[PDB]
């Protein structure tokens, strides 16, 4: 059960990481714009 909890947190971490890289791309685009 604790492993399932940590895997759920891992999913959240992965989605947040993807969203943060996407926002990094957006910030670079706005900066060069």
Partner 1 sequence: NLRSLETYERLEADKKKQVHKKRKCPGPIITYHSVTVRCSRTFITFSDDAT
Partner 2 sequence: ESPSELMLTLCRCGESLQDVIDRVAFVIPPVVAAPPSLRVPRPPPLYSHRMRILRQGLREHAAPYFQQLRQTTAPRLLQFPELRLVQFDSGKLEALAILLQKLKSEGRRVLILSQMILMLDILEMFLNFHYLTYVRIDENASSEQRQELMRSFNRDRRIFCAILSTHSRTTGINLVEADTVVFYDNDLNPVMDAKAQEWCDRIGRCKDIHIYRLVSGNSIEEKLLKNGTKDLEELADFMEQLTPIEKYALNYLELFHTSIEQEKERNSEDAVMTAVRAWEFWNLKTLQEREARLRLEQEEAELLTYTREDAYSMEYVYE
* Residues at the contact surface with partner 1, assessed by CB under 8 A: 4, 7-8
- Determine phi and psi for 17, rounding to 5 degrees: -65, -45
Q: Which of partner 1, partner 2, none binds 4 (CB below 5-8 Å, type-dependent)? A: partner 1
> What six digits make up the tokens of 31?
């900066």
1-33: contacts with partner 2 (CB under 8 A)? 5-6, 9-10, 12-13, 15-16, 19, 22-23, 25-26
Helix, strand or coil, per DSSP, at residue 13: helix
Residue 8 or 28: which CB sits closer to partner 1?
Answer: 8
Helix, coil or strand: residue 1: coil
């Amino acid at each position: 059960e604790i492993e399932c909890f940590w895997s759920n947190i891992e999913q959240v971490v992965e989605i947040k990481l993807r969203v943060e890289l996407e926002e990094k791309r957006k910030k670079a685009l706005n900066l060069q714009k």
